[PDB]
């Protein structure tokens, strides 16, 4: 029956939550049920950082980063290896 005590959600004291769109499928998933991951990366890959820094017109300009929050449905979180299927006794670990 109940594979999870919380039913796979994060909703406890309410009846409805708004929807969000899967970043890969475009599916509609509720805000709590969606798999939310955060990403902070530089706009230049590790190979090209040296090339840009060589020929630059600015004194010591610091390369900016990009920040975006990605939300995945369950199907596209498992398939994209964002999350894995865990053991029956290891499902309970929340760290």
């Amino acid at each position: 029956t109940s594979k999870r005590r919380n039913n796979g959600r994060s909703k406890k004291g309410r009846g409805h939550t708004q929807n969000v769109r899967c970043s890969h499928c475009g599916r509609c998933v509720p805000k709590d049920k969606a798999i939310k991951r955060y990403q902070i990366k530089n706009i230049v890959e590790a190979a090209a950082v040296r090339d840009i820094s060589d020929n630059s017109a600015l004194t010591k300009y610091k390369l900016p980063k990009t920040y975006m929050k990605l939300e995945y449905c369950v199907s596209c979180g498992i398939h994209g290896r964002v999350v894995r299927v865990r053991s029956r006794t290891d499902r309970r670990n929340r760290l």
């Binding site: 499928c25 475009g26 509609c28 706009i43 090339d51 630059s56 017109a57």
Partner: protein
Amino acid sequence: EVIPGSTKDAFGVAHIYATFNDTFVHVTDISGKETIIRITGGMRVKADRDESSPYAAMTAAQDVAKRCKDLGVTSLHIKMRGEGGVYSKTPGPGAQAALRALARANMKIGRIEDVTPIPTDCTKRKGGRRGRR
């Protein structure tokens, strides 16, 4: 002698718009209303599946670089961008290749910025409730 309309060391801004289905290299002036040279990844390929290849990005980027030096533009501002309207905001693979190609063409780079348009709030996304399958 000098190419008509060209000047000395000046500044331009490159609008690198690279999706997963194509890539754009587009340089304008500081105002942005005048374009110098616009080359896309689809003009340097034959089949339709290679317009997003990183190889097509540098080939288009080098052609942009060569023209700009001949026209007096020597340094560029980078405005990196992807199709981030309501869809994935991650720029395509050719975005980094084009920027690295411009650097390796001995072009001074000024400020680098990400100008993917993030909606303050969005219209309905294509696909439906259950999305792509």
